[PDB]
């Protein structure tokens, strides 16, 4: 029920799933893995 890798993802849409490995990248604006 979230977002994937690669992911168009925003500040106030953090859908992307902050819980496994999925957080909005810094960098890109698209969300990256978690090293």
Same mark, same amino acid.
């Given at each position: 029920?979230? &977002?994937?890798?690669?992911? @168009?993802?925003?500040?106030?849409?953090?859908?992307?799933?902050?819980?496994?490995? &999925?957080?909005?990248? $810094?960098?890109? $604006?698209?969300? @990256?893995?978690?090293?």
């Amino acid at each position: 029920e979230c &977002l994937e890798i690669f992911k @168009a993802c925003n500040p106030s849409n953090d859908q992307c799933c902050k819980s496994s490995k &999925l957080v909005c990248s $810094r960098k890109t $604006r698209w969300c @990256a893995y978690q090293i």
